[PDB]
PDB file of all heavy atoms in Angstrom:
ATOM      1  N   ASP A 353     -13.112 -13.217  90.397  1.00  2.00           N
ATOM      2  CA  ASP A 353     -12.818 -13.903  91.630  1.00  2.00           C
ATOM      3  C   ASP A 353     -14.057 -14.320  92.399  1.00  2.00           C
ATOM      4  O   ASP A 353     -15.166 -13.828  92.200  1.00  2.00           O
ATOM      5  CB  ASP A 353     -12.003 -13.016  92.552  1.00  2.00           C
ATOM      6  CG  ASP A 353     -10.598 -12.809  92.085  1.00  2.00           C
ATOM      7  OD1 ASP A 353     -10.096 -13.636  91.299  1.00  2.00           O
ATOM      8  OD2 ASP A 353      -9.972 -11.843  92.569  1.00  2.00           O
ATOM      9  N   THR A 354     -13.831 -15.251  93.306  1.00  2.00           N
ATOM     10  CA  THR A 354     -14.842 -15.753  94.207  1.00  2.00           C
ATOM     11  C   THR A 354     -14.270 -15.923  95.596  1.00  2.00           C
ATOM     12  O   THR A 354     -15.030 -15.967  96.567  1.00  2.00           O
ATOM     13  CB  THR A 354     -15.389 -17.096  93.702  1.00  2.00           C
ATOM     14  OG1 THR A 354     -15.604 -17.009  92.292  1.00  2.00           O
ATOM     15  CG2 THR A 354     -16.740 -17.416  94.318  1.00  2.00           C
ATOM     16  N   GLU A 355     -12.945 -15.995  95.730  1.00  2.00           N
ATOM     17  CA  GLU A 355     -12.305 -16.182  97.020  1.00  2.00           C
ATOM     18  C   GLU A 355     -11.015 -15.391  97.220  1.00  2.00           C
ATOM     19  O   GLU A 355     -10.384 -15.535  98.269  1.00  2.00           O
ATOM     20  CB  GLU A 355     -12.004 -17.680  97.197  1.00  2.00           C
ATOM     21  CG  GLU A 355     -10.943 -18.175  96.220  1.00  2.00           C
ATOM     22  CD  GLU A 355     -10.710 -19.669  96.293  1.00  2.00           C
ATOM     23  OE1 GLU A 355     -11.498 -20.364  96.943  1.00  2.00           O
ATOM     24  OE2 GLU A 355      -9.688 -20.143  95.759  1.00  2.00           O
ATOM     25  N   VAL A 356     -10.600 -14.573  96.260  1.00  2.00           N
ATOM     26  CA  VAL A 356      -9.344 -13.830  96.341  1.00  2.00           C
ATOM     27  C   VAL A 356      -9.564 -12.408  95.871  1.00  2.00           C
ATOM     28  O   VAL A 356     -10.539 -12.126  95.168  1.00  2.00           O
ATOM     29  CB  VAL A 356      -8.257 -14.500  95.485  1.00  2.00           C
ATOM     30  CG1 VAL A 356      -7.647 -15.637  96.226  1.00  2.00           C
ATOM     31  CG2 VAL A 356      -8.885 -15.020  94.217  1.00  2.00           C
ATOM     32  N   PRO A 357      -8.691 -11.478  96.246  1.00  2.00           N
ATOM     33  CA  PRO A 357      -8.882 -10.128  95.734  1.00  2.00           C
ATOM     34  C   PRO A 357      -8.398 -10.126  94.307  1.00  2.00           C
ATOM     35  O   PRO A 357      -7.523 -10.899  93.925  1.00  2.00           O
ATOM     36  CB  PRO A 357      -7.995  -9.260  96.629  1.00  2.00           C
ATOM     37  CG  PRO A 357      -6.948 -10.148  97.060  1.00  2.00           C
ATOM     38  CD  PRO A 357      -7.587 -11.489  97.222  1.00  2.00           C
ATOM     39  N   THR A 358      -9.001  -9.268  93.509  1.00  2.00           N
ATOM     40  CA  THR A 358      -8.583  -9.209  92.125  1.00  2.00           C
ATOM     41  C   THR A 358      -7.264  -8.494  92.016  1.00  2.00           C
ATOM     42  O   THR A 358      -6.260  -9.075  91.601  1.00  2.00           O
ATOM     43  CB  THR A 358      -9.640  -8.514  91.334  1.00  2.00           C
ATOM     44  OG1 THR A 358     -10.855  -9.210  91.611  1.00  2.00           O
ATOM     45  CG2 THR A 358      -9.302  -8.606  89.881  1.00  2.00           C
ATOM     46  N   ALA A 359      -7.237  -7.244  92.420  1.00  2.00           N
ATOM     47  CA  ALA A 359      -6.018  -6.464  92.443  1.00  2.00           C
ATOM     48  C   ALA A 359      -5.811  -6.010  93.874  1.00  2.00           C
ATOM     49  O   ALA A 359      -6.760  -5.614  94.550  1.00  2.00           O
ATOM     50  CB  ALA A 359      -6.085  -5.272  91.505  1.00  2.00           C
ATOM     51  N   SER A 360      -4.586  -6.097  94.354  1.00  2.00           N
ATOM     52  CA  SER A 360      -4.324  -5.678  95.718  1.00  2.00           C
ATOM     53  C   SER A 360      -2.958  -5.028  95.768  1.00  2.00           C
ATOM     54  O   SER A 360      -1.970  -5.628  95.346  1.00  2.00           O
ATOM     55  CB  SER A 360      -4.394  -6.840  96.702  1.00  2.00           C
ATOM     56  OG  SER A 360      -3.293  -7.701  96.526  1.00  2.00           O
ATOM     57  N   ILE A 361      -2.903  -3.807  96.270  1.00  2.00           N
ATOM     58  CA  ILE A 361      -1.669  -3.060  96.360  1.00  2.00           C
ATOM     59  C   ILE A 361      -1.542  -2.622  97.804  1.00  2.00           C
ATOM     60  O   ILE A 361      -2.505  -2.662  98.568  1.00  2.00           O
ATOM     61  CB  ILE A 361      -1.690  -1.864  95.390  1.00  2.00           C
ATOM     62  CG1 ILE A 361      -0.304  -1.302  95.098  1.00  2.00           C
ATOM     63  CG2 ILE A 361      -2.527  -0.786  95.941  1.00  2.00           C
ATOM     64  CD1 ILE A 361      -0.280  -0.269  93.997  1.00  2.00           C
TER      65      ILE A 361
END
Side-chain angles (χ1 to χ4, degrees):
Chain A
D353 289 338
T354 317
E355 67 185 11
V356 279
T358 306
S360 71
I361 198 171

